Nucleic acid binder design. Structure first.
Ligand SMILES: *[C@@H]1O[C@H](CO)[C@@H](O)[C@H](O)[C@H]1NC(C)=O
Ligand SMILES: *[C@@H]1O[C@H](CO)[C@@H](O)[C@H](O)[C@H]1NC(C)=O
Length: 725
DNA sequence: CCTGGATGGGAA
């Protein structure tokens, strides 16, 4: 009956991740397994016979078994990996090895990143003529230090005639390795000390599609972590360095202390799709340069964090393939009609990153003049007015104005933004009585995020100027009218959040709508509200058609049948997560006929005794995890015909009995029983139940632990065989 | 290259 691969899990992948193993597991027949993952175990020594039973392995991951500081040194016998003559992928990263082990020629992908291998010679990689991918980053840098530098000897990799990918980051390299295999398409040599580049360093690299030479001359101003400042003032780039790269699609020159651009650099890069110029000193350069003149196939340009009014250069009008532009951390306080003028006629520019720029003045109307803008991020600036649920992803004209300095919303600020479909105003300081006058131009707005503000919500004309509004986020919002009276007057509103709100005395005793389908009302005081007797007894009843209701964290200690009966009869989902429900009659679920999903986790249902799941509930999933459930009455789940998922994890069950379920147990798609102090006597009967539904219980192989006996406590229900008595 | 703003992943 047992799973064949104790103490690991069978997914042709055998998963043995995070099992504290100090040796390679031996386990039926192991002849059919092809993938083995042993990530973050404790294997510090490998041996000639350790993989002999796994001769058919294609993929082997040994990452994080013997990590150097922060020490650990891994020893590897000469023949360990040779047993696997068809090994294709191997990850040896985060292991304390000093030389590369002998490897079979079948190998295609190899990772030696974050090890202690300080020299690569022709003998290091002997016979790897089918190698396509080689990564070795992080062998000589501040988090994995070394004296001197990694050494890659001239022509060492020439035997790798099929090599397409090579990464040698964080290795204190002073020069590009010489005579690299001409087959290269990807070369990452960033974050070394290569302070000078010429065409010679890239000699015969004519199949390159991406080159990353960034971080080799680093300004270390306001560096959070240890950083080697460049001896030079700038990366020294020979003007002809890149010309022969005719298939170059990606180039990254980030953090190179570049003070000017030279159009020579890109002159022959006729398929440059992605250019990264971030973290340099190109503030003035992007304002005046001509370098962009012919960058005609460029789709992505990153100018972020490049340290009189900012105005992009005229050459930017040539970037007619440009889809995405990053201008974060440039720090310009003004956004006018000349700032981004040369972008406006670009036929495919859909994404504009403009955050962390301390913008305190913005004519946002400019974004209505663009050809295909779909997302402009203006978050984390200092905008305070007009000048003088967000997903929304990819498909909607979206603007992010979060974390700005808006205290008051004036409708003139939105002139010519009338195509906006999604908008965020969250984490501002808007203290305003919203009255239906604030968002007039926003005729097409569907999604509005106003969370983390100080809105006054008494006025029933609130948001009535937003006739397409479908989703309104008012979460974490802090004597006339009534709170939330506006909800009934928004005919399109399908999704609403009033979570973690300041719910005052004059709050409307009713929420009404014909359209709201999801209401998040978590983190409020529904416990205190429903304690007020009849006053809030029908609070949610007016939400006709409501499908989803979140009442998490509302300090609920009881749920009377009247309160359930007076929720909208359309409910399919109800969450009472993280309340204080101590007792609850399950037959009262009859008052929610269409209920499919019920979440009662984080409460204190000490047991599942009081009543049963009633005929003929349509309940599909029941989450009752993190309750101190010590007992379940037989046939409890028996009547829930449609039951498919049940989570009993983190309860105080000593067993899990078949009698709780009946025939339903075999249509269950999940049955989670983890983190129960199971009592693992030699007689224990739950073991035979769990094995029957093994395919449908998560983490059975080793995640289902014993709470007793004392020697078996904290250990798997297979740490000893329990079926021996 | 992706990711963030620092770094680690990655895998024809
Ligand atoms: C762009 O290419 C043309 C020739 O095709 C050349 O005359 C012009 O100088 C180039 N622009 C720059 C700045 O490289
Ligand atoms: C079951 O509940 C626990 C509670 O923390 C959660 O961690 C786990 O992801 C849930 N499992 C399933 C199958 O959803």
């Amino acid at each position: 009956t047992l799973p064949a691969f104790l103490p690991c899990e069978l997914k042709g992948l055998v998963d043995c991740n995070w099992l504290f193993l100090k040796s390679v597991p031996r386990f039926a027949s192991c002849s059919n397994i092809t993938r083995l993952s042993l990530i973050s175990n404790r294997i510090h020594h490998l041996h000639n016979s350790d993989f002999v039973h796994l001769s058919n392995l294609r993929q082997l991951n040994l990452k994080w078994n013997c990590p150097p500081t922060g020490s650990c040194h891994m020893t590897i016998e000469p023949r360990t990996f040779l047993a696997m003559r068809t090994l294709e992928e191997l990850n040896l990263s985060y292991n304390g090895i000093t030389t590369v082990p002998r490897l079979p020629s079948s190998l295609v992908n190899l990772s030696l990143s974050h090890t202690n291998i300080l020299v690569l010679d022709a003998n290091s990689l002997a016979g790897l003529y089918s190698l396509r991918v080689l990564f070795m980053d992080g062998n000589c840098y501040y988090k994995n230090p070394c004296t001197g530098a990694v050494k890659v000897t001239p022509g060492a990799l020439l035997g790798l005639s099929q090599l397409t990918h090579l990464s040698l980051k964080y290795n204190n390299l002073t020069k590009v390795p010489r005579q690299l295999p001409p087959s290269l398409e990807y070369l990452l040599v960033s974050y070394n000390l290569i302070v000078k580049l010429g065409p010679e360093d890239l000699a015969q690299l004519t199949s390159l599609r991406v080159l990353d030479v960034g971080g080799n001359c680093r300004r270390c101003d306001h560096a959070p972590n240890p950083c080697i400042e460049c001896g030079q003032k700038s990366l020294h780039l020979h003007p002809e360095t890149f010309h022969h790269l005719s298939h170059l699609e990606g180039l990254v020159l980030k953090d190179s202390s570049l003070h000017t651009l030279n159009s020579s650099w890109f002159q022959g890069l006729v398929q440059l799709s992605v250019l990264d110029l971030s973290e340099n000193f190109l503030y003035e350069s992007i304002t005046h340069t001509n370098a962009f003149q012919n960058l005609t196939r460029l789709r992505k340009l990153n100018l972020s964090f490049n340290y009189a009014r900012l105005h992009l250069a005229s050459s930017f009008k040539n970037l007619v393939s440009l889809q995405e532009l990053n201008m974060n951390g440039i720090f310009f306080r003004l956004l006018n009609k000349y700032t981004l003028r040369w972008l406006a006629d670009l036929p495919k520019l859909h994404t504009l990153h403009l955050q962390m720029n301390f913008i305190n003045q913005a004519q946002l109307s400019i974004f209505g003049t663009f050809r295909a803008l779909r997302f402009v991020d203006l978050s984390d600036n200092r905008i305070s007015g007009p000048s003088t649920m967000d997903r929304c992803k990819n498909f909607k004209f979206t603007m992010d104005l979060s974390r700005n300095n808006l205290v008051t919303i004036k409708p003139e600020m939105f002139v010519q933004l009338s195509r906006l479909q999604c908008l965020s105003l969250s984490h501002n300081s808007i203290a305003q009585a919203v009255n239906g006058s604030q968002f007039l131009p926003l005729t097409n707005l569907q999604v509005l995020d106003l969370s983390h503000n100080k809105l006054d919500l008494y006025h029933w004309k609130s948001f009535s100027e937003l006739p397409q509004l479908q989703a309104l986020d008012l979460s974490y919002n802090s004597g006339i009218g009534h709170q939330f009276s506006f909800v009934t007057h928004l005919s399109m509103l399908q999704s609403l959040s009033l979570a973690h709100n300041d719910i005052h005395t004059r709050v409307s005793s009713h929420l009404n709508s014909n359209s709201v389908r999801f209401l998040d009302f978590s983190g409020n005081g529904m416990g205190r509200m429903w304690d007020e007797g009849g006053l809030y007894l029908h609070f949610f009843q007016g939400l006709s058609g409501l499908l989803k209701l979140d009442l998490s964290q509302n300090n609920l200690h009881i749920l009377r049948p009247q309160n359930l009966d007076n929720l909208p009869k359309s409910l399919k989902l109800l969450s009472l997560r993280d309340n204080y429900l101590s007792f609850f009659n399950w037959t009262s679920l009859s008052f929610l006929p269409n209920l499919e999903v019920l979440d009662l986790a984080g409460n204190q249902l000490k047991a599942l005794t009081q009543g049963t799941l009633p005929n003929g509930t349509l309940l599909q999933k029941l989450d009752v995890s993190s309750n101190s459930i010590v007992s379940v009455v037989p046939a409890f789940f028996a009547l829930a015909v449609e039951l498919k998922e049940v989570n009993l994890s983190h309860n105080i069950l000593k067993t899990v009995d078949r009698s709780w379920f009946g025939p339903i147990v075999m249509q269950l798609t999940v049955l989670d029983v983890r983190s129960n102090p199971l009592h693992c006597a030699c007689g224990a009967a739950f073991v035979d139940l769990l094995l029957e539904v093994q395919t449908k219980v998560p983490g059975l192989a080793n995640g289902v632990k014993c709470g007793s006996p004392g020697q078996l406590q904290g250990r798997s229900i297979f740490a000893q065989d329990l079926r021996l008595c």
